[PDB]
Design an enzyme around this catalytic site. Sequence first.
Site, mmCIF file in Angstrom:
data_model
loop_
_atom_site.group_PDB
_atom_site.id
_atom_site.type_symbol
_atom_site.label_atom_id
_atom_site.label_comp_id
_atom_site.label_asym_id
_atom_site.label_seq_id
_atom_site.Cartn_x
_atom_site.Cartn_y
_atom_site.Cartn_z
ATOM 1 N N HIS A 291 30.164 -89.880 -19.228
ATOM 2 C CA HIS A 291 30.808 -89.599 -17.716
ATOM 3 C C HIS A 291 30.458 -90.356 -16.956
ATOM 4 O O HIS A 291 31.813 -90.208 -16.293
ATOM 5 C CB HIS A 291 29.959 -88.659 -17.753
ATOM 6 C CG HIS A 291 29.681 -87.120 -18.600
ATOM 7 N ND1 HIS A 291 30.614 -85.913 -18.494
ATOM 8 C CD2 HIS A 291 29.267 -86.928 -19.516
ATOM 9 C CE1 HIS A 291 30.228 -85.863 -19.719
ATOM 10 N NE2 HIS A 291 29.412 -86.125 -19.964
ATOM 11 N N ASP B 44 32.605 -84.567 -11.927
ATOM 12 C CA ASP B 44 32.798 -83.902 -12.802
ATOM 13 C C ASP B 44 32.819 -82.697 -13.044
ATOM 14 O O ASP B 44 32.466 -82.303 -11.901
ATOM 15 C CB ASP B 44 31.631 -84.659 -13.611
ATOM 16 C CG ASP B 44 31.141 -84.623 -15.316
ATOM 17 O OD1 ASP B 44 31.656 -83.737 -16.220
ATOM 18 O OD2 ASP B 44 31.447 -86.303 -15.241
#
Length: 434
Positions: A14, A100
């Site tokens: 991520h 995210d």
Amino acid sequence: RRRIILFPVPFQGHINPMLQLANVLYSKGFSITIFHTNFNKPKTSNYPHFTFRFILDNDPLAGMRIPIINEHGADELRRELELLMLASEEDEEVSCLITDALWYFAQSVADSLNLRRLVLMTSSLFNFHAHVSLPQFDELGYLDPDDKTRLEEQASGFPMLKVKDIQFGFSNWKQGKEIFENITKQTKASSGVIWNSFKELEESELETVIREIPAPSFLIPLPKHLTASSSSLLDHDRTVFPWLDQQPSRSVLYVSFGSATEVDEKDFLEIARGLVDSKQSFLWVVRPGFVKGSTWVEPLPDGFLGERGRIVKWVPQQEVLAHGAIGAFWTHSGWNSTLESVCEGVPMIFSDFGLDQPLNARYMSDVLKVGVYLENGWERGEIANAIRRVMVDEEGEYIRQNARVLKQKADVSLMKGGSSYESLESLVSYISSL
């Protein structure tokens, strides 16, 4: 002058994408603040042009922070936002926040502030198809793991997938669609959605995106923009680059299995033999703490390969994959590693440790046709008959062919007058024109 606030999820898969996007956005003019827990914090000296704010903790099992943050973070996230919006000079307003997807709760916080939130999708359009049609998958009991899934048997509608893909790929029915419900919701409620991909990579799922997302989505292959080397949470052994040079062209299998993944002592050895059994030169990364009931690679016996391959803790993969010495990549069907592959143009062996890895494996195997998916666990015959297949066998030239057709397409994206090219001018226009 305009500030973007980024807010990764502090796990390599991520961080990697989120900061690549950060670098691309600084290019095009924006001030760049990054929200990040103190957990798994990346090296900040690497990013001299980004301002960093640590939050939420200023005084596989580790992935519970995600749900714990979602419910308990809201009021802390809102505070720091307002701080930053306040202190911001007359001439440095915050244009937007970019999180995210898994930060499905930022959208309330942003909503509450009226700041508009964009979303960074670290997985694929296909992934997001899966999650969209999850209430369609509850019905047929694909989410039910009590009975069984049918043998190599297609689910419903236009089933590029199979029921195993979902079965294992949604093997947290213990928790259930409770989480994913919101992720999908919180993606659609958004002011925009950036995809880590390009337009030829997933052109079937465009419709799924142009249907479900009222906000503009923008298709952007980050690895092709820039490498994620300086967001590595672990230290690169570069001693592999002088070696690879002295492997002949395309005689090395790279082998990474994620940043989280664990395996039994039984399987680790199993994985081990198959690599030797294949009789190929292979560089195989092994994390510190990958093998269970051990620290590193004690389980390895002496007198395995030794000449053909070498193990290591960690490497700068994209930089690796781009070496000619590379012939294939034994991925774990993590998306970045998978995407990195296509863009540097290498064919892959697949695997799945749940979440999304079957899905990825599936439609990289069959749709695009750029790999070989060990569906059925780990056998020291199969593994070696996947590696020989992709690499040496004369019966995977269609794998090798496709895996590099798709690469030229990527370059074309980023070449002017191309999807990715335009998508970035647009995204940029979409941030400024606010």
